[PDB]
Amino acid sequence: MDAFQGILKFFLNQKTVIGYSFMALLTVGSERLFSVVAFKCPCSTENMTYGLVFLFAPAWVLLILGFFLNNRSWRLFTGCCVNPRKIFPRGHSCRFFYVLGQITLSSLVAPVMWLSVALLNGTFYECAMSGTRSSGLLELICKGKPKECWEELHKVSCGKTSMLPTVNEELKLSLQAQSQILGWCLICSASFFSLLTTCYARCRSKVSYLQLSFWKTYAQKEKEQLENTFLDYANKLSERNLKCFFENKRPDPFPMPTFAAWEAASELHSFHQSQQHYSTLHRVVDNG
Amino acid sequence: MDAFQGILKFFLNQKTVIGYSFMALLTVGSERLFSVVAFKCPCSTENMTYGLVFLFAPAWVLLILGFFLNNRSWRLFTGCCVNPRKIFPRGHSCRFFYVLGQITLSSLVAPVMWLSVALLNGTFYECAMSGTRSSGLLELICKGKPKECWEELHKVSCGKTSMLPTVNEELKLSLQAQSQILGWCLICSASFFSLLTTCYARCRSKVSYLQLSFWKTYAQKEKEQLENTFLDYANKLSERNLKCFFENKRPDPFPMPTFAAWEAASELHSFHQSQQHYSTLHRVVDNG
Amino acid sequence: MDAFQGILKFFLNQKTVIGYSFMALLTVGSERLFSVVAFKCPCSTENMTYGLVFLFAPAWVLLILGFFLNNRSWRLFTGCCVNPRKIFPRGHSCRFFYVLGQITLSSLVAPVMWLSVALLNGTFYECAMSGTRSSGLLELICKGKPKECWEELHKVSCGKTSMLPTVNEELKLSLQAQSQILGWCLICSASFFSLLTTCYARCRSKVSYLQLSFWKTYAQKEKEQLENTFLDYANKLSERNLKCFFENKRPDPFPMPTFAAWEAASELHSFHQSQQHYSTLHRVVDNG
Amino acid sequence: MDAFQGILKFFLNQKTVIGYSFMALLTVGSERLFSVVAFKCPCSTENMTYGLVFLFAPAWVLLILGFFLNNRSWRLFTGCCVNPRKIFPRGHSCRFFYVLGQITLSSLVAPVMWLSVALLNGTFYECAMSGTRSSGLLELICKGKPKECWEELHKVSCGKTSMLPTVNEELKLSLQAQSQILGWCLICSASFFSLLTTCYARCRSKVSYLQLSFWKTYAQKEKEQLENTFLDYANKLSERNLKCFFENKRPDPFPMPTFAAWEAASELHSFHQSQQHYSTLHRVVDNG
């Protein structure tokens, strides 16, 4: 009765680590569906373009999908060209780049998680590195191999190469291991950069830990109370407009906030410790 | 009791991304039914027409089906020839093309999702590119092949070609990889164009984010309250007409809105920030 | 309790697209039962008649079945020869052809859906095109074939033809692909004609979108209220007639509408915007 | 609770098309039991009689079974020889043939549905057409066959014929396809005749669509109210007769309708628009 409610406190408080763990399980299961069912490397001069598109084109699609599902990217830009100075204010002219950096860094998580699982399953790199045709990086792969390594390297994936197939089986192990080292150098350097920018944003905060915990509680249910006020004032307005249409009556006046009050409550909020307001709707009510 | 109600808030708020994800799962499962069960490429001079019809004719059918299921295409055109100046108003003469651009762009989503899954499963392009018979684009496919590649290329799908079947197996890999590169160039450029026009429509909006959130709440249940008023005034009218038919009585008068009020409430709505009305039914009640 | 009621709103509002999707699933499953279990092509001079009857005779039966199940075809014709001028009125003498065009076009949907699934499964066309015996259209099928293609083409379905069975297997692929191109040319041109006549009927309507939505709500439950009035006046009439038969009594009079009022309420309804009546029963009550 | 009641309206309104679809499913499943388990063609001079009895004798039995289960054939004939002029009235002397045509045409549906499924499964026609022994119709089957087709055709079903069994396998395909063409010519011409006589009976009706819908509602529950009056007056009569037998009492009189009133209420009903009566029991109560 209340024991199951006691463990739903544990699955709602740690909700930012279940969401990032369900994103990793979807990225792993989607890469194994592309490499098994759809990917089959040719053995042509189009090896470089074919393997480098299966690596970077699903990363470009996941980046654009992060801009659609980000709710604070639409709060920033909706109605921008009416007056752009409400997004570029006079006191804090560089807060627009701080907010825009947060949308960009938050939507760069699922692209990086794609590039790491695709490099730890080294089939896309093996196809792309075969057709390299470069002066450097070709002596490193073919070091103690016969002389037909510099011409027929791009056929090592499909088989069907006349250079003694115990040599072909160890050229597919030297390329499958170069990709898995790059897959760990990307996980290790993106985890360190992610902690270094989160720790810098908290160390440079204007409030301490206890006031920031109240600020997050207020902003969470200013959103819930705003959905119930919109849903209450729109039932009273639609009931008024329908009775005066069918009965041909003149309506009683309906008081709504003006246009200057709607646009002032939609600005960008920056904290000031002299007068502590926790939203921009809190600020226009207290100041008038 | 209320825990399952708490997660139906999560499956009703994100309803525009479950609908677009269920459309992609139906398009993938329908392309695998056509390519496995029905598609079998001939090896004739009709290769070009056969493969290019299985690509573009299910895209033409899905485009017409998007015009039928679009509710705002019927609100725009019903009763057009009575007076066309209610669709071409005097102040905003170019809003008719802005609305018509929204029906066209919204119904172009399922055609593009068909053309991408059909190109990532490269059977329709392999049949169509075989019978090309062009001066260009035929030297690119047959580069280091024997001289019977320029005459018997259209038989490479069915087998039964006398050009050493290790050469036929790598002409089917060079065409199956050219189609999968075009399948990713279409997903990447349609995702970028879809974000560029949505961001331009929000940046050029007349209202800010908070007033647009109230406008969407009002328009959603002006539709629910209109279905309950129509259902209430049609029960009272059918009860009146049936008692005066069987009993041979003369009826009491039933007040309804006139024809000039029905047609004025069906016009096209454009926001004005001087007098803020949230529908065209709100405007004819307040103005008279 | 009310959550399942909330999704039955979604399965009752979109009821005209579940009915047309269940008709397509029955037509596909019925064509696979005829082509697998019953159809087996002979190899005689009766190839043309045998395959062209399995194509067009189930389309003729589905057209006649659409006239039986159309409720508005019986409302138009019942009691026609009593006075034909109630179906050919004086003001609108061409509305009879507009209504008769709607019964004909609505019952032509299941014949066209039969002819498309039968042509996309190319067994009926392969049997019928084999026995063509025409000067044209026989050189197009036999282009680079031996000279026994002009005489023994009608045996290519059954096998047992002495023209090198790798040639017989590619004459069955050139005919199975000509039928699937015609199956897509019929789906594409019937979808475009279906949208062009629906859009012309809405653009030429006498009322706008909002008045047409009330008109459909009234006509739906004038039918429900008429079934409850007939069921109420027939219980009171059968109770009266049975008590005066067994007890040998004389009955009290039972007031019913006259014959001139029954026939005037059964005419064909055309909207007029000067006096807006939503049925022909609404018109004879208000006018007398 | 009421949702399942809402769909039983759909399975009771369309009750005349579920009954005709369950008759077709029983006729198909009964023909496959006769042709698989019981039918085995001899190869004698009795081929013509054996196959033509399995075709027409189950059609004769299904026709007689339609006269037993027709309730309006017993209402017409019961008590005929008491006075035949109540079935041959003076004003409408040709209504007796119109009613008798309705019993005959309604009971001719299951015979025609037997003859069509038996001809679409061409085993009964193949046995019967083999032993034809006619001057015509024997040159059409044996056109380009050896000379032992005119003498040993009746053995082609059982096998065991010395005319090169690739010729016997294509004489069994030319007869199995002649029967399936006749099976579609019977379905197509009986569907067209069934619509042509129903449309002529409705176009020549005395009442319009709305008065005919009330007439069908009254006749349906004059039958239900008559079963409850018979069941109520027979409980009161059997209680009276049993108390006066065991107690040796004299009974109180029980008023019943006379013999002239029982026979007048059992006549044949024809509508008159001058005095509109909806049954013959309605007419003898109002007229006396």
Residue numbers in the entry:
A (entry chain A), B (entry chain K), C (entry chain J), D (entry chain I): 1 to 288
Excerpt from the paper describing this PDB structure:
To further investigate the CALHM channels, we purified human CALHM5 and determined its structure by cryo-electron microscopy (cryo-EM). CALHM5 assembles as an undecamer, showing an overall truncated cone-shaped architecture, with approximate dimensions of 95 Å in height spanning the cell membrane, 125 Å in extracellular width, and 145 Å in intracellular width. Each subunit consists of a large transmembrane domain (TMD) that comprises four transmembrane helices TM1–4 and an N-terminal helix (NTH), an intracellular C-terminal domain (CTD) consisting of three α-helices CH1–3 and an extracellular loop region. CALHM5 exhibits an unusually large pore along the symmetric axis which is broad at both entrances with a measured diameter of ~60 Å and is slightly narrowed down at constriction.
